[PDB]
Structure formats: structure tokens, C-alpha cells
Design a protein around this ligand. Structure first.
Ligand SMILES: C[S@@+](CC[C@H](N)C(=O)[O-])C[C@H]1O[C@@H](n2cnc3c(N)ncnc32)[C@H](O)[C@@H]1O
Ligand SMILES: Nc1ccn([C@@H]2O[C@H](C(=O)O)[C@@H](O)[C@H](O)[C@H]2O)c(=O)n1
Ligand code: SF4
Ligand code: SF4
Length: 327
């Protein structure tokens, strides 16, 4: 059994205003507690978890995020945080001293003039880049998440050499996901600008993780451009559901991957309950049933997968294993 990733949606509140996320302008009051994390830690330790990644709205708004990293690290967990970067320069020193192993910053443009518009938060791009440079010199692994659609794909060649020059060592480039259909006016122009980004020398240019956001095979690219179906785990099986646990903190839901919490599917809550009798438990029979469904059906029904997770499952299918921070 491999080293698993545990996502915790610490909170839903956020300080940004992104057009594409439900937590834009969220002032929700739920806060995942240190008491919850103390009960969860031994359960994740025996569940084979080696990575705990904090997400949500904006985790740097959680007043305990540094103490959570400190306690997770003291239990042997490789700690990671996904942030929009606005507060990262102010907290990266304390986070690094607390044992933070990886920082993920979400950038959706090659410059402040575009990113700060997409997230409607002037100064967020600049603070994200500072926090990445500061994390690099503090020994933290710097990764960037990018969401790309018709509105910003021409910026990706510029973001690539910005990230490269800044010392970022991992880059997720995944497609915009919305309920409504997403159509590019000219898919050939998307390939003409973005194929060189993926065809760059990884020795000199940061090329993104996993699959290309518009697909790798001609069939995947047709399914993405013509029918807005995002690339997912190929092959017959998805193996991400064995290595990833995503805890929707506010509600009581645990998911077998980091994209299934954002799906629609049924109407009753997705995933499985995190608690059985007020007691936090992992890999419950309901959770194993939830994961078993998407292990078989994921490659066939999942319209909201990410490029990182698709490449993760494929490496398990072809190679039998993944490198440390492949998720
Ligand atoms: C919900 S955010 C929470 C962490 C932090 N607030 C941030 O943005 O980096 C987690 C990731 O999901 C991405 N995301 C948000 N809305 C998305 C969408 N509609 N389609 C694809 N990715 C999305 C964001 O870019 C971010 O990298
Ligand atoms: N509408 C959305 C919004 C976010 N996500 C996923 O959220 C994950 C997280 O919350 O941590 C991220 O790691 C991942 O990059 C992103 O793709 C999604 O799948 N669909
Ligand atoms: S900063 Fe993160 S949580 Fe907030 S609206 Fe943007 S993507 Fe959503
Ligand atoms: S195929 Fe489905 S279950 Fe598997 S990683 Fe992608 S979204 Fe998750």
C-alpha cells in the first residue's frame, strides 16, 4: 500500500472573489478545530497517510493553520497548503519554521494585470510570487496550481517562464470547470500556443504535471473541445481513489479524491460520513464502497477530473508507483 494524501477543507471563507469558485466572497464561520485534527491524526497515521494538504476557502485565514502544520509534522506527516498567496509573505516564515513541506499557490495569469483581475484582488499575484520565492529559500517545495480556459490560455507561455525564473518546481495546469459548457473559439490556436509549453525542455523550463489540460490523445482533445469533458484517469481503472482522502470539513463528508467533492452527480451527500457515532473514522465500509464505485467507473463518468490526478492514476497503471509529490 502506497503513501496516501489526505486533504482537509479547513474552512470555506475566503478573501478573494474568483469568478469560477463557490467560495468567492465567502464569510462562512466553520473552522476545522485543533481538537478535530488531534482525533484525526492517529486515524490517518494508521490509514497509511503520509501527506496532509490543507485547502478550503483560504487556509491562511484559519488562525490555527501554523499550529496544524506543526502538529501534523510532529506526527511524521509531510504538510502542504493550497493558498491564493495574498497572506503568504506574512506567514511563510512561521509556516516554514512549523515544518511546512510544500506550498501551493494558485496563479491564473502571467502577470498581476490579469491574475489580480480574475481573482478581483489587487496585489494577490505579487504576494503569491514573493511567497513562492521566500518559500524556496526557506526549503519549502514551491508548487503552483493554474486554472486555464478560453480567458487566459494565451498567458500560459508567459506564466511558464515566470514560474521557471521564480524557482517554482511543480506546476499543475488544469482546465476550468463549470456547470455550463465551455467553448474555445479556436482550438488550433490553443494547441499552437500551449503545445510548446508541454514540449519544452524540462531541464530549462517548468513543464506541467500529468496530462495536458486539453487532453493528450486526439480523442481526448476532441472530447474536451467539442463536449467540455475534461481529461481524467484513462485505462480501465482509476487508482487515485486508493491514495487520496478528501475531508469536507464543514459537512461530514470524506471523498476518495480531490475532485469528487466539487461534483454534482446525485442529490444526497456524496462521499461517505467522516464520523460514525461522533467518532472520526477513515476507510469506513461506506467510504470503501464510495471509492470502489469510482475505481471502476471513474474513467467513464467523471467530467471534472484534474490533470494531476489523471497522470497520477496513469503512472500507477503503467508503472505501479509514483514519485513523492506527484499529487
Ligand atoms: C478552492 S481553492 C482553495 C485553496 C486556495 N484558496 C487557492 O485558491 O489556492 C483550491 C484550488 O481549486 C481551484 N479551482 C477553484 N475553482 C475551480 C474551478 N471552477 N475549476 C477548476 N479549478 C478550480 C483553485 O484554482 C485552487 O487552486
Ligand atoms: N470546481 C472545482 C474546484 C476545485 N477543484 C479541485 O479542488 C482541489 C482542492 O480543493 O484542493 C484542488 O486540489 C484541485 O486542483 C481542484 O481541481 C475541482 O475539482 N473543482
Ligand atoms: S481564492 Fe481559492 S477559495 Fe477563494 S474564491 Fe479563489 S479559488 Fe475559491
Ligand atoms: S477519474 Fe474521477 S475519481 Fe478518479 S481522480 Fe479523476 S475525478 Fe477522481
Amino acid at each position: 500500500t502506497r503513501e496516501r494524501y489526505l486533504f482537509i477543507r479547513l474552512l470555506e471563507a475566503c478573501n478573494a472573489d474568483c469568478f469560477m469558485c463557490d467560495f468567492a466572497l465567502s464569510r462562512d464561520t466553520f473552522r476545522f478545530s485543533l481538537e478535530d485534527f488531534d482525533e484525526l491524526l492517529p486515524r490517518a497515521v494508521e490509514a497509511g497517510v503520509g501527506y496532509i494538504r490543507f485547502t478550503g476557502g483560504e487556509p491562511l485565514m484559519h488562525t490555527d493553520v501554523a499550529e496544524l502544520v506543526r502538529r501534523g509534522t510532529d506526527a511524521g506527516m509531510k504538510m502542504s497548503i493550497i493558498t491564493n498567496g495574498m497572506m503568504l509573505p506574512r506567514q511563510i516564515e512561521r509556516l516554514a519554521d512549523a515544518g511546512l513541506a510544500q506550498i501551493i499557490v494558485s496563479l491564473d495569469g502571467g502577470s498581476a494585470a490579469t491574475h489580480d483581475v480574475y481573482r478581483r484582488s489587487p496585489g494577490m499575484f505579487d504576494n503569491g510570487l514573493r511567497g513562492l520565492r521566500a518559500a524556496a529559500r526557506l526549503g519549502v517545495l514551491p508548487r503552483v496550481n493554474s486554472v486555464v480556459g478560453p480567458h487566459n490560455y494565451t498567458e500560459m507561455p508567459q506564466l511558464q517562464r515566470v514560474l521557471t525564473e521564480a524557482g517554482v518546481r511543480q506546476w499543475e495546469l488544469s482546465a476550468l470547470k463549470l456547470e455550463r459548457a465551455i467553448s474555445y473559439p479556436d482550438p488550433d490556436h490553443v494547441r499552437a500556443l500551449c503545445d510548446p509549453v508541454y514540449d519544452a525542455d524540462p531541464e530549462h523550463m517548468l513543464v506541467p504535471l500529468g496530462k495536458r489540460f486539453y487532453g493528450d490523445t486526439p480523442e481526448e482533445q476532441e472530447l474536451y473541445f467539442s463536449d467540455s469533458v475534461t481529461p481524467r484517469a484513462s485505462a480501465p481503472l482509476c487508482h487515485v481513489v486508493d491514495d487520496v482522502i478528501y475531508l469536507d470539513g464543514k459537512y461530514g463528508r470524506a471523498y476518495a479524491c480531490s475532485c469528487l467533492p466539487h461534483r454534482e452527480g446525485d442529490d444526497e451527500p456524496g462521499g461517505a460520513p467522516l464520523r460514525e457515532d461522533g467518532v472520526i473514522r477513515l476507510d469506513t465500509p461506506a467510504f470503501r464502497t464510495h471509492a470502489d464505485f469510482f475505481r471502476t467507473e471513474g474513467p467513464r463518468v467523471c467530467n471534472g477530473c484534474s490533470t494531476t490526478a489523471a497522470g497520477y492514476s496513469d503512472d500507477i497503471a503503467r508503472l505501479g508507483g509514483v514519485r513523492p509529490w506527484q499529487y
